[PDB]
């Protein structure tokens, strides 16, 4: 039972939501900071270092658990985290990240960087176009 539909991309690009999220729109903490946000900057700035972040949506609300971290690493068990997929250095201001995940039968990514003053940034969906072929590849042998 695989989950990868016929077209993927015709999901990831007509879907609404999935539209609307596919693209870019402001974003803002709502995970554990409901508490600690002031130290959620930290908590936040840390989870990079393992390549995890909970980001918020403010295109519908949608909270948003993702790993983070680069796909190109094989048997380097230790979690470091890199400013390819996980940036924590000032290359804008604000920090991104870009992880890959598994939405409605379709392989994506979402990207976007946090403000380590307000707490809050850009973030926005894409389709993987590299990951999606293989699926058809391994799906189909």
Same mark, same amino acid.
């Given at each position: @039972?695989?989950?990868?539909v ?5 999901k ?6 999935f ?9 803002? &903490?709502?995970? $554990?900071? /409901?508490?600690?946000?002031e ?15 909970? #980001? ?7 909270? =948003?658990?993702?790993?983070? $971290? ?14 390819? &997929?996980?940036? !924590? ?7 991104? =990240?870009?992880?890959? @995940? #598994? !939405? ?9 960087? #946090?403000? =380590?003053?307000?707490?809050?940034? @850009?973030?926005?969906?894409?389709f /993987? ?8 590849? =391994?799906?189909?042998?």
């Amino acid at each position: @039972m695989p989950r990868v539909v016929p077209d993927q991309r015709s999901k990831f690009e007509n879907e609404e939501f999935f539209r609307k999220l596919s693209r870019e729109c402001e974003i803002k &903490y709502t995970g $554990f900071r /409901d508490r600690p946000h002031e130290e959620r900057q930290t908590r936040f700035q840390n989870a990079c270092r393992d390549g995890r972040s909970e #980001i918020a949506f403010v295109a519908t609300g949608t909270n =948003l658990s993702l790993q983070f $971290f680069p796909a190109s690493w094989q048997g380097e068990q230790r979690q470091t985290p890199s400013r390819e &997929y996980v940036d !924590l250095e000032r290359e804008a201001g604000k920090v991104y =990240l870009k992880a890959p @995940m #598994i !939405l409605n039968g379709v392989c994506v990514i979402w990207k976007g960087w #946090i403000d =380590l003053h307000r707490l809050d940034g @850009m973030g926005c969906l894409e389709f /993987d176009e590299e990951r999606a072929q293989q699926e058809d590849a =391994l799906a189909q042998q």
